[PDB]
Amino acid sequence: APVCCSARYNLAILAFFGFFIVYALRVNLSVALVDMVQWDAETQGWILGSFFYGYIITQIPGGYVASKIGGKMLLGFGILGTAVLTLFTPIAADLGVGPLIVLRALEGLGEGVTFPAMHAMWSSWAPPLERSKLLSISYAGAQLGTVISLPLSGIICYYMNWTYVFYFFGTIGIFWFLLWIWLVSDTPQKHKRISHYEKEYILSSLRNQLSSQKSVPWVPILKSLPLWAIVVAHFSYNWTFYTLLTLLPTYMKEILRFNVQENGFLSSLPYLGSWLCMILSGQAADNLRAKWNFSTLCVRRIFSLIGMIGPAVFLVAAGFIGCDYSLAVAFLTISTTLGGFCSSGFSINHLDIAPSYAGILLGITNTFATIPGMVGPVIAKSLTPDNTVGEWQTVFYIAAAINVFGAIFFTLFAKGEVQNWALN
Structure with a gap:
């Protein structure tokens, strides 16, 4: 029963696919800006680099916010926000370069908060014995997301208008948030569909007693x-x-x-x-x-x-x-x-x-x-x-x-x- 395709691994395959979207929303613009050159703009490195002006801001507070709010809501709202803001990318570009900078900087404010939230969630959802395997499964999501997002963005820009990428991935993100909510719980004890058994995680975490002073x-x-x-x-x-x-x-x-x-x-x-x-x-x-x-x-x-x-x-x-x-x-x-x-x-x-x-x-x-x-x-x-x-x-x-x-x-x-x- 606890072999595979049930319980913890399910959560993993929701994060991996989830991260498949996440990093995509950062790597698609690098292709889209190739197709969008359509506007005229010089020294547009600010457009490509504003995504960090929020990543650096939210990299540190992620842990503190995840400790109180919780991994579920934090990660879900982060991905929903970045997907929604990606849906608004062509409009922001139409308004001007400054709107694009401020929109692509609000993105990254939800990007950086993802990793601390995921880490906080698996501080309780992952037994120490198999923690490395699950963490690898989840963090491979980012790499596979970039690797698949570049060809997808290229193909969509070649066969359709560029803006559609900011639509396509975007709706997938919403679809992710339309499913993740009813398939993931912050703590294993409160989760539904887990049914009896599967007390291995709780017992292992209690016996390990990983809590420290945190001075x-x-x-x-x-x-x-x-x-x-x-x-x-x-x-x-x-x-x-x-x-x-x-x-x-x-x-x-x-x-x-x-x-x-x-x-x-x-x-x-x-x-x-x-x-x-x-x-x-x-x-x-x-x-x-x-x-x-x-x-x-x-x-x-x-x-x-x-x-x-x-x-x-x-x-x-x-x-x-x-x-x-x-x-x-x-x-x-x-x-x-x-x-x-x-x-x-x-x-x-x-x-x-x-x-x-x-x-x-x-x-x-x-x-x-x-x-x-x-x-x-x-x-x-x-x-x-x-x-x-x-x-x-x-x-x-x-x-x-x-x-x-x-x-x-x-x-x-x-x-x-x-x-x-x-x-x-």
Whole structure:
């Protein structure tokens, strides 16, 4: 009975599909702006980057709001709000650029609150023994959502008007909120259709007694060198990721001169490669831990190096290659794929440094690392007004320099193990 297709896993498959919508509402514009150029606008990096001006605001308060309101209502209203605001995207564009900025900034105010709400919900819906599997199932939703949203947006823009994407995904989100509400409960005890049995989750949670003091010593937290190393490393990685996420379709259209359908397919190939590389790299890291006796810090630093320096090399190789179609696409795809190793880098490091105080450190390392989201598209769409090869190469060079600096900082300052300030 508790094998599959019932109870907890059901919740999982509602989050995964749900996250399939969520990240889509962030990745569709990068394709839609390719089709919408129809309006005339320059230095439109603000349009692409405003989504962060709300992501950074709501990244931290997510946990505090989820503790009181609860994961169900918080996540449901966040997704409903972002879907509704996506439904209003063409109207906001019609009114003007400023309305689009303010609408796409209110989006992201519901995007960032999703992860803390989901984490709070599975703080009670997920037994510790199988928590990793469920968390992986849910968080694969974001990657698969991007990977499927790019081709879908490209196809809809090629066969129909661009605005329909902001409709299509939007209604799906509403449909999600039209179903999730009557299939998910905040706590397992209050849930219906669970029926008898399935007391494994409650008994396991009660026996584990995962509740801690939660003293949140912010002063030692802000004076922890490995934490700042992780922050800088995630800053660099998010800079590269957001530059290659909000501007890749623009790069393909302006420079590679691909069609919209091609701009939707060959732009999704890199992220599909990254997701597959993540899946394989989890097992690769497990085998490296098992077969060879390597310290945790060494494993983290070598994975971070091989997953950041490599992206810098292949991204600077994306430039200097000219307008060659296949070679440039292959270099970009390999860059993102090789950056896929970073999953066994930063993230599974913040758990190592302080397992007890996880989440708070995750919030710190996410809020400081979305400044790249705000400043990357703006500074990258600027400095390339003429869409020349050299102008884009300058952006690629600065991204590679940021990655090299971040990798050196991380491998020189991260200490691993468990830090003193977080020990019972």
